[PDB]
Design an enzyme around this catalytic site. Structure first.
Site, PDB file in Angstrom:
ATOM      1  N   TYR A 102      -8.196 112.945 -22.083  1.00  0.00           N
ATOM      2  CA  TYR A 102      -9.214 113.968 -22.206  1.00  0.00           C
ATOM      3  C   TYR A 102     -10.575 113.374 -21.898  1.00  0.00           C
ATOM      4  O   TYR A 102     -10.823 112.189 -22.126  1.00  0.00           O
ATOM      5  CB  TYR A 102      -9.212 114.572 -23.603  1.00  0.00           C
ATOM      6  CG  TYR A 102      -9.678 113.614 -24.669  1.00  0.00           C
ATOM      7  CD1 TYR A 102      -8.779 112.793 -25.322  1.00  0.00           C
ATOM      8  CD2 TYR A 102     -11.011 113.528 -25.019  1.00  0.00           C
ATOM      9  CE1 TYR A 102      -9.192 111.918 -26.290  1.00  0.00           C
ATOM     10  CE2 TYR A 102     -11.432 112.654 -25.987  1.00  0.00           C
ATOM     11  CZ  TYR A 102     -10.518 111.852 -26.621  1.00  0.00           C
ATOM     12  OH  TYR A 102     -10.925 110.971 -27.592  1.00  0.00           O
TER      13      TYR A 102
ATOM     14  N   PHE B  67     -19.614 113.151 -24.290  1.00  0.00           N
ATOM     15  CA  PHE B  67     -19.677 112.431 -25.556  1.00  0.00           C
ATOM     16  C   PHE B  67     -18.447 111.557 -25.777  1.00  0.00           C
ATOM     17  O   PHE B  67     -18.534 110.530 -26.455  1.00  0.00           O
ATOM     18  CB  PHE B  67     -19.835 113.403 -26.732  1.00  0.00           C
ATOM     19  CG  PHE B  67     -18.765 114.446 -26.815  1.00  0.00           C
ATOM     20  CD1 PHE B  67     -18.851 115.613 -26.091  1.00  0.00           C
ATOM     21  CD2 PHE B  67     -17.677 114.262 -27.645  1.00  0.00           C
ATOM     22  CE1 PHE B  67     -17.866 116.566 -26.185  1.00  0.00           C
ATOM     23  CE2 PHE B  67     -16.695 115.212 -27.740  1.00  0.00           C
ATOM     24  CZ  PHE B  67     -16.790 116.364 -27.011  1.00  0.00           C
ATOM     25  N   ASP B  68     -17.298 111.952 -25.236  1.00  0.00           N
ATOM     26  CA  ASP B  68     -16.054 111.225 -25.447  1.00  0.00           C
ATOM     27  C   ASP B  68     -15.214 111.237 -24.181  1.00  0.00           C
ATOM     28  O   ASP B  68     -15.375 112.118 -23.334  1.00  0.00           O
ATOM     29  CB  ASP B  68     -15.255 111.828 -26.600  1.00  0.00           C
ATOM     30  CG  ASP B  68     -14.146 110.922 -27.070  1.00  0.00           C
ATOM     31  OD1 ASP B  68     -14.111 109.753 -26.640  1.00  0.00           O
ATOM     32  OD2 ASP B  68     -13.305 111.376 -27.868  1.00  0.00           O
TER      33      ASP B  68
ATOM     34  N   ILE C 132      -8.603 118.711 -33.965  1.00  0.00           N
ATOM     35  CA  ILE C 132      -9.261 119.948 -34.374  1.00  0.00           C
ATOM     36  C   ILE C 132      -8.498 121.164 -33.839  1.00  0.00           C
ATOM     37  O   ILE C 132      -7.637 121.066 -32.954  1.00  0.00           O
ATOM     38  CB  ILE C 132     -10.733 119.984 -33.932  1.00  0.00           C
ATOM     39  CG1 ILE C 132     -10.878 119.672 -32.443  1.00  0.00           C
ATOM     40  CG2 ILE C 132     -11.548 119.001 -34.758  1.00  0.00           C
ATOM     41  CD1 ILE C 132     -12.303 119.677 -31.969  1.00  0.00           C
TER      42      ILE C 132
ATOM     43  N   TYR D 252     -16.040 121.235 -34.655  1.00  0.00           N
ATOM     44  CA  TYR D 252     -16.605 120.750 -35.908  1.00  0.00           C
ATOM     45  C   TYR D 252     -17.489 121.800 -36.571  1.00  0.00           C
ATOM     46  O   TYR D 252     -17.562 121.865 -37.802  1.00  0.00           O
ATOM     47  CB  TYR D 252     -17.377 119.464 -35.639  1.00  0.00           C
ATOM     48  CG  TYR D 252     -16.482 118.392 -35.077  1.00  0.00           C
ATOM     49  CD1 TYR D 252     -15.644 117.663 -35.899  1.00  0.00           C
ATOM     50  CD2 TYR D 252     -16.445 118.139 -33.718  1.00  0.00           C
ATOM     51  CE1 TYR D 252     -14.816 116.697 -35.389  1.00  0.00           C
ATOM     52  CE2 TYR D 252     -15.618 117.174 -33.199  1.00  0.00           C
ATOM     53  CZ  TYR D 252     -14.806 116.456 -34.039  1.00  0.00           C
ATOM     54  OH  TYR D 252     -13.977 115.490 -33.526  1.00  0.00           O
TER      55      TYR D 252
ATOM     56  N   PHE E 124     -13.498 120.443 -22.667  1.00  0.00           N
ATOM     57  CA  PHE E 124     -12.611 119.301 -22.504  1.00  0.00           C
ATOM     58  C   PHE E 124     -11.806 119.428 -21.222  1.00  0.00           C
ATOM     59  O   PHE E 124     -11.315 120.507 -20.891  1.00  0.00           O
ATOM     60  CB  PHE E 124     -11.644 119.166 -23.678  1.00  0.00           C
ATOM     61  CG  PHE E 124     -12.303 118.814 -24.970  1.00  0.00           C
ATOM     62  CD1 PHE E 124     -12.635 117.506 -25.247  1.00  0.00           C
ATOM     63  CD2 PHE E 124     -12.586 119.781 -25.905  1.00  0.00           C
ATOM     64  CE1 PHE E 124     -13.237 117.171 -26.427  1.00  0.00           C
ATOM     65  CE2 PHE E 124     -13.190 119.448 -27.089  1.00  0.00           C
ATOM     66  CZ  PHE E 124     -13.514 118.140 -27.350  1.00  0.00           C
TER      67      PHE E 124
END
Ligand SMILES: Nc1ncnc2c1ncn2[C@@H]1O[C@H](COP(=O)(O)OP(=O)(O)OP(=O)(O)O)[C@@H](O)[C@H]1O
EC number: 5.2.1.8
Lengths: 806, 107, 144, 48
Positions: free
Chosen positions: B26, B36-37, B56, B82, B99
């Site tokens: 991902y 961010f990731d 999540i 979140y 994503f």
């Protein structure tokens, strides 16, 4: 990126065929994936240049261009009326695959640095013949015009016998038989009149040139003898070409240059007529489709056709000279292209500043692959990219093309190079001198000194530097591989000069002057423009006022000026669904923000433009007007129909001051300032403008999350040009509240130090990557098309400036 | 609201089932386009078991919808992600997450 | 050419005659090159030929050329300097010591035949002597 | 938004055939054009 629906959507994968269709008339661009329609189009985009197919990629692909004809077989039939692209290739050049605006390439001895490439413009394809219709033939010219026209037909028929042609009822190149060949009277009179009028046009175009021709000697007409023509030269019809013969006639060099211009005008006039009929260019001839290979302006036309046309005109010019009429070549009319600025066009390559040398004896080489304009030498670290090398005092260079040495101006020195010549540059900081060698021989000034420059002040050090003009190529060898240097042993080795990069472990990094306009803060020492930060009194809000320092004085600079504010305002991520004292609840709730611009009296509102610019605005246009602004509409709809949406994208959102200037005031200089206010609603995405309180009709709509910079484009016409006023209107928040988060709810106008005025700068320094993607381009085959391949990955660490989205 | 949009086709037959480990790559970005990731940066596929409530909820539904070998874009609303609290330091409060998720295999 | 230039430097009268001759004849030395010491053909010819002579010696020989110039400043005779260099053999430059000599030796070896040259110590010492003497006299001339 | 951001990105390059078409009043060029591209090989993630 805007999602587009197509059957079986997926990211381009192997065995996918993408068909691209361009219709310049609408204008529109449409796509097809594996023959299936792609439900989306680009339209309403600008048409001020030439369009070319392009594929952009990163490492790890193989693709194939299919251009039709013998350059790739289309997998799907083109839509009706769409020409295959292979036809578009110009007569001079052959089809192949290129990079786009490369500042370097590879070569057998190393990397070549490349200067800008001169590129055509859409206007270049418009034929622009000089109009001879106004001209009336001299009486004497009338007498020759007719007989010359008949002789020209005879010359053409005689050429046709060499072509092997025979009279034909219908002309076929395969047949070898032409109906067009006949005695002037045998030839249809409407066809013959065309020959006669065309010969008349040649006399008239000579008049357009301004050459003066008065018939001189009658005996000269008697001297010429028409060449005897054989039956074999004669057509199957038996019409025999009877061109007059003038071996004696000779052409003056000025007259020979005149014959080129006349042929050019003749090709240009022929093209205009064919376009008016409806013909168009095509690499492959299609008479039924009215497509011709010849239908291109003379300059673009191929050299063989150029010389054929020039031969015809030369023979006709000689026939005019043979009659005896003397034609005086017209004085050469001055004309300078002045298309570009020298410094902004020529690209400067220099070493990184950290490599600057402040002592020692250093050497490097520069081979001129082309003979054109280049400069090579030593530059100080704080060299400017805008200025031409040597025009200022920061660079000591040599321009062999003309044979000059450049520093604070030009002085004759040395001799010009030829292709493949190597210039060895030496700097001696112990003695404070600079030397240039050509092919290992020291270049000497007219005075005979062997030092190009002397009394050099070391200062902050020196760097190798080279400048290349458009269409130029140079191989720079800083001498990391000492054995690679060509003339170091012949000159510079024994004298103790060291190659510039002799003991370096990695190749020396270089920077080039990238001509992409970028916004930069207005320099505090700028000679022409000054920005004053005005405090906000009780009656006046904070302001940033621009004034022209040198207005009204000789040497003053007057040119278009593009200004923006250093910080943007960003629209909300999600748009909303569907006394004179501000009310507290309204002012706290409002999402509308305001800022104004005051154009001072004496500054032309017609010359002022006010509005916003997105981060990706890079146009430095001296002739700017709202028509130049980039814009394009993306339209998405269902396959059956029913367009879903149509979005207009642009990088400039502005209103012209001429719109607000009243018709009576137009043509007259007003004595009142013009205030233009700009309002933006961050939640709605709507942009409106007001002029002197009144509302303008111009309004704009933007997509969520967009960034907009306040901007003013102005051509100064007064000492005080414009003022950015950072205030508020009743129940409308000031700009600072949008710009800064800590002030999101504060309604008091203010201009923090970070907010400043930035001006567009044409050129800036940029770092050349140490490694470049290795792309292989070839022709897989006549059926397969052209192949592009790139397999080796390459990455860099990118530093992002969030506010500028750069 | 998690919205799934195919980027590359999958088999169309194998779908994750509860208690079955999902292996993915991902790349995560905020709605406005900041990354961010990314598992590819770490160079190690991310593994998680469906139903363990360890990833999540937007991921739970999105991967449940995807099929083996499929690459897809998942747009996950804040309340699926979140949410109001956010991920301090990483994800701002009330942020939609996009994503680029590829489901390598099921195990 | 070097020996002629050394004679020029040593004999004051020869300089007198070259200056008088150039002035009287009014001949332009700059015309030949393309009055002054630089214009003096005697110096110009040696300057032109000097790289040829330096090409004779090797980079390691430079260390010895420095000391030879020092002796010539001390005013030792030519044979005296030859013997000084003869006994001072180990003073030859060391390739490993300095990086620059590494690439200079790279060039010296790359050019053919130079490795064969300088094999014998006597030729080394005579070559260093000649080049050093010429350079020393050039130094005296360039000095006011 | 305040601190400079860093990331690794792929180098990208563009390729064109030397084919140029435009529209101008009186221009000799034709209006409508068509071409194709066939994708032989692609590596979806050759890098990160
Ligand atoms: N572009 C031109 N400019 C001037 N004269 C021309 C041009 N094209 C043709 N001519 C001349 O006009 C006359 C008629 O043209 P031509 O005999 O070549 O007919 P065509 O072969 O049917 O047409 P074209 O060659 O123009 O395609 C001939 O004298 C030819 O030399």
């Amino acid at each position: 990126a805007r999602p587009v629906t197509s059957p079986g959507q997926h990211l381009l994968a192997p065995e996918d065929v993408v068909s691209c269709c361009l219709d310049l008339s609408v204008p529109s661009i449409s796509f097809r994936i594996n023959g299936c329609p792609v439900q989306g189009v680009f339209e309403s985009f600008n048409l001020d240049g030439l369009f070319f197919p392009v594929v952009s990629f990163s490492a790890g692909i193989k693709v194939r261009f299919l251009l039709g004809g013998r350059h790739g077989e289309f997998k799907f039939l083109p839509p009706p009326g769409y020409a295959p692209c292979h036809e578009a290739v110009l007569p001079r050049e052959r089809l192949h695959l290129q990079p786009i605006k490369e500042y370097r390439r590879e070569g057998p001895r190393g990397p070549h640095l490349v200067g800008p490439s001169r590129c055509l413009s859409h206007l270049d394809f418009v034929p622009c013949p000089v109009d001879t219709i106004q001209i009336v033939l001299p009486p004497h010219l009338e007498r020759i015009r007719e007989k010359l026209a008949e002789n020209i037909h005879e010359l053409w028929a005689l050429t046709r016998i060499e072509q092997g042609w025979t009279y034909g009822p219908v002309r076929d190149d395969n047949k070898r038989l032409h109906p067009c060949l006949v005695n002037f009277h045998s030839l249809p009179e409407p066809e013959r009149n065309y020959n006669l009028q065309m010969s008349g046009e040649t006399l008239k175009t000579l008049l357009a040139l301004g050459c003066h021709v008065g018939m001189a000697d009658e005996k000269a007409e008697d001297n010429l003898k028409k060449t005897k023509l054989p039956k074999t030269y004669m057509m199957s019809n038996g019409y025999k070409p009877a061109p007059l013969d003038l071996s004696h006639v000779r052409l003056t060099p000025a007259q020979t240059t005149l014959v080129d211009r006349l042929a050019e005008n003749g090709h240009n006039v022929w093209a205009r007529d064919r376009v008016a009929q409806g013909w168009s260019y095509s690499a492959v001839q299609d008479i039924p489709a009215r497509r011709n290979p010849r239908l291109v302006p003379y300059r673009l036309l191929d050299e063989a056709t150029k010389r054929s046309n020039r031969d015809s005109l030369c023979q006709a010019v000689r026939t005019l000279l043979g009659y005896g009429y003397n034609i005086e070549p017209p004085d050469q009319e001055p004309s300078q292209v002045d298309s570009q600025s020298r410094g902004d066009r020529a690209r400067i390559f220099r070493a990184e500043k950290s490599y600057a040398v402040q002592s020692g004896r250093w050497y490097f080489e520069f081979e001129a692959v082309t003979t054109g304009e280049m400069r090579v030498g030593w530059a100080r670290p704080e060299l400017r990219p805008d200025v031409e090398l040597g025009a200022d005092d920061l660079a000591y260079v040599f321009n062999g093309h003309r044979g000059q040495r450049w520093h604070l101006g030009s002085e004759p020195f040395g001799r010009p190079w030829q292709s493949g010549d190597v210039v060895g540059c030496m700097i001696d900081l112990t003695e404070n001198t600079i030397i240039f060698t050509l092919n290992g021989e020291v270049l000497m000034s007219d005075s005979g000194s062997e030092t190009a420059f002397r009394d050099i002040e070391i200062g902050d050090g020196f760097l190798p530097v080279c400048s290349l003009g458009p269409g130029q190529v140079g191989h720079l060898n800083l001498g990391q591989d000492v054995s690679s240097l060509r003339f170091f042993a012949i000159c510079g080795l024994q004298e103790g000069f060291e190659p510039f990069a002799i003991n370096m472990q990695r190749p020396v990094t270089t920077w080039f002057s990238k001509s992409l306009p970028q916004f930069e803060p207005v320099p505090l020492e700028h000679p022409h423009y000054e920005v004053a930060r005005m405090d906000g009194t009780v009656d006046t809000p904070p302001c940033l006022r621009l004034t022209h320092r040198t207005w009204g004085s000789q040497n003053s600079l007057v040119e278009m000026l593009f200004l923006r504010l250093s910080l943007p305002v960003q629209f909300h991520q999600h748009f909303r669904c569907t006394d004179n004292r501000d009310d507290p609840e309204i002012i706290l709730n409002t999402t509308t923000y305001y800022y104004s611009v005051r154009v001072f009296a004496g500054q032309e509102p017609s010359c002022v433009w006010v509005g916003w610019v997105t981060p990706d605005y890079h146009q430095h246009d001296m002739s700017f007007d709202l028509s130049k602004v980039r814009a394009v509409t993306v339209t998405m709809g269902d396959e059956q129909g029913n367009v879903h949406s149509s979005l207009k994208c642009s990088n400039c959102y502005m209103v012209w001051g001429g719109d607000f200037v009243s018709p009576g005031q137009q043509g007259r200089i007003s004595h009142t300032d013009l205030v233009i206010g700009c309002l933006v609603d961050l939640a709605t995405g709507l942009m409106t403008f007001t002029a002197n309180g009144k509302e303008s009709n111009t309004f704009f709509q933007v997509e969520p999350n967009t960034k907009l910079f306040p901007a003013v484009f102005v051509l100064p016409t007064h000492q005080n040009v414009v003022q950015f006023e950072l205030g508020k209107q009743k129940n409308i928040m000031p700009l600072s509240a949008a710009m800064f988060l800590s002030e999101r709810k504060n309604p008091a106008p203010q201009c923090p130090p970070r907010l400043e005025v930035q001006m567009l700068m044409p050129v800036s320094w940029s770092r050349m990557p140490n490694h470049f993607l290795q792309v292989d381009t070839r022709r897989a085959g006549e059926r397969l098309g052209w192949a592009v391949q790139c397999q080796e990955p390459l990455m860099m660490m990118a530093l992002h400036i969030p506010e500028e989205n750069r | 609201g998690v919205q799934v949009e195919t980027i590359s086709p999958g088999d169309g037959r194998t779908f994750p089932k509860r208690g079955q480990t999902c292996v993915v790559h991902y790349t995560g970005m905020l709605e406005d386009g900041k990354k961010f990731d990314s598992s590819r940066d770490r160079n190690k596929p991310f593994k998680f078991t469906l139903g363990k409530q360890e990833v999540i909820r937007g991921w739970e539904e999105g991967v449940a919808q995807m099929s083996v070998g499929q690459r897809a874009k998942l747009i996950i609303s804040s309340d699926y992600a979140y949410g109001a609290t956010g991920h301090p330091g990483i994800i701002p409060p009330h942020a939609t997450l996009v994503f680029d998720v590829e489901l390598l295999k099921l195990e | 050419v070097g020996e002629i230039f050394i004679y020029w430097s040593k004999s004051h009268n020869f300089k007198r005659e070259e200056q008088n001759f150039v002035v009287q004849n009014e001949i332009n030395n700059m015309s030949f090159l393309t009055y002054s010491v630089q214009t003096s053909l005697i110096v110009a010819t040696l300057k032109k030929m000097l790289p040829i002579g330096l090409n004779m010696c090797a980079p390691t020989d430079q260390d010895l050329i420095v000391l030879a110039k020092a002796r010539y400043a001390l005013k030792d005779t030519d044979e005296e300097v030859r013997e000084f260099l003869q006994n001072n053999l180990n003073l030859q430059g060391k390739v490993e010591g300095s990086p620059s000599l590494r690439w200079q030796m790279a060039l010296y070896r790359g050019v053919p035949g130079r490795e064969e040259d300088a094999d014998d110590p006597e030729k080394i010492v005579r070559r260093v002597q000649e080049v050093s003497a010429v350079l020393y006299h050039l130094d005296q001339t360039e000095h006011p | 938004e305040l601190l400079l951001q860093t990331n690794l990105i792929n180098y990208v390059t563009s390729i064109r055939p030397n084919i140029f078409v435009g529209r101008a009043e009186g221009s000799t060029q034709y209006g409508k054009w068509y071409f194709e591209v066939m994708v032989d090989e692609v590596a979806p993630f050759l890098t990160a």
